[PDB]
Amino acid sequence: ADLEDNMETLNDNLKVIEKADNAAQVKDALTKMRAAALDAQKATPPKLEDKSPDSPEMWDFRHGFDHLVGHIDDALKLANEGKVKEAQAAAEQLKCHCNACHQKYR
Ligand code: HEC
Numbered sequence: 886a887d888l889e890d891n892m893e894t895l896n897d898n899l900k901v902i903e904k905a906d907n908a909a910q911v912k913d914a915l916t917k918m919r920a921a922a923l924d925a926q927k928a929t930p931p932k933l934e935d936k937s938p939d940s941p942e943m944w945d946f947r948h949g950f951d952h953l954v955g956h957i958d959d960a961l962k963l964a965n966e967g968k969v970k971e972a973q974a975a976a977e978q979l980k981c982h983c984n985a986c987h988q989k990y991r
């Protein structure tokens with residue numbers, strides 16, 4: 886339930902989505918990723934521990950998860966429609982946003 890746990894949940898469930906057989910597994914994984922992203926959003930990452938909680942870095946860190954959740958919600962709509970392959974493709978759009986936050990704050 887710490888930041889590192891949230892990241893492990895995000896990473897593990899993206900791989901679940903990639904390997905998924907049906908829409909139910911994609912939806913279940915995305916729902917777990919959604920919770921993890923909103924939990925992570927409340928953390929102070931180690932790199933930013935000396936910054937102000939109101940700093941632009943901390944607000945950029947938090948905003949990154951808002952957009953991640955937006956992408957998760959798009960993939961969730963497709964998974965709820967039974968479109969496994971398009972839900973999976975929508976979920977791959979997450980990866981550039983994982984990487985972008987990591988490049989700044991990992
Ligand atoms: C900021 C808005 C983030 C986004 C979006 C994602 N991640 Fe992340 N991640 C972030 C930080 C600050 C860290 C380091 C945390 C620490 O305590 O040092 C990480 C780390 C990871 C890791 C490896 C280390 C770990 O804590 O598990 C992984 C495997 C990881 N993150 C995965 C991941 C994925 C798959 C994401 C998109 C679905 C993703 N992260 C987004 C910050 C942010």
Ligand SMILES: [Ca+2]
Nearest residue numbers: 886887888924
């Ligand atoms: Ca937590």
Ligand SMILES: [Ca+2]
Nearest residue numbers: 930931932991
């Ligand atoms: Ca670290």
